[PDB]
């Protein structure tokens, strides 16, 4: 599923993402926008290291989920990477929360540093009722 901006914003707020480990909702919106275009079925194979990025937050298979084909992988979220391709983002949110609980925070995603950090991210939640 491809979420519309405000629909996703409201979904994230209900899932407890606003201010989770100091991360405002607009930052999470910014991250989802640049990672997958708010698409829960997006996947990116990294030919270079044999890992794959899954879902709306493009969570990597080397560290967070199991896809069985990534060498030296850990499954820190204790989930099949399939779980990150569902229309219901609950699993992906619980995994994203796990990612940030690591002494990197939102900076864990280089896309966030490139496109969101130090920028005016208010546009992502404007008019959404969140």
């Amino acid at each position: 599923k491809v979420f519309e901006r405000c629909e996703l914003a409201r979904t994230l707020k209900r899932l407890g993402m606003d201010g989770y480990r100091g991360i405002s909702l607009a930052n999470w919106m910014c991250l989802a926008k640049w990672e997958s275009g708010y698409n829960t079925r997006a996947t990116n194979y990294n030919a270079g290291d044999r890992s794959t990025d899954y879902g709306i937050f493009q969570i990597n298979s080397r560290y967070w989920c199991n896809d069985g084909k990534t060498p030296g992988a850990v499954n820190a979220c204790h989930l099949s990477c399939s779980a990150l391709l569902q229309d219901n983002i609950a699993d992906a949110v619980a995994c994203a929360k796990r990612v940030v609980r690591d002494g990197q925070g939102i900076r864990a995603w280089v896309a966030w540093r490139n496109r969101c950090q130090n920028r005016d991210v208010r546009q992502y939640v404007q008019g959404c009722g969140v």
Side-chain angles (χ1 to χ4, degrees), residues 80-102:
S80 156
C81 294
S82 191
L84 304 183
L85 296 183
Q86 307 179 65
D87 294 340
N88 186 301
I89 68 174
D91 296 317
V93 161
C95 187
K97 282 179 183 177
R98 187 35 223 135
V99 172
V100 300
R101 291 205 294 273
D102 280 64

Side-chain angles (χ1 to χ4, degrees), residues 23-34:
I23 306 157
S24 78
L25 192 60
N27 274 295
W28 288 113
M29 289 295 302
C30 188
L31 174 70
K33 191 275 182 176
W34 295 106

Side-chain angles (χ1 to χ4, degrees), residues 3-65:
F3 283 81
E4 319 244 64
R5 187 175 58 95
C6 294
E7 181 202 6
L8 173 64
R10 290 185 300 260
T11 302
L12 295 180
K13 190 169 174 58
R14 291 186 315 260
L15 290 171
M17 295 281 266
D18 194 30
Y20 183 80
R21 305 274 286 169
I23 306 157
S24 78
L25 192 60
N27 274 295
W28 288 113
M29 289 295 302
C30 188
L31 174 70
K33 191 275 182 176
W34 295 106
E35 290 280 8
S36 65
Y38 311 137
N39 184 358
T40 65
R41 295 185 290 141
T43 68
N44 169 93
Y45 173 72
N46 308 292
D49 86 334
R50 294 188 186 278
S51 74
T52 301
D53 303 316
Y54 288 94
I56 201 158
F57 295 115
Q58 286 293 274
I59 282 171
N60 187 267
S61 71
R62 168 156 326 276
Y63 301 109
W64 313 109
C65 64

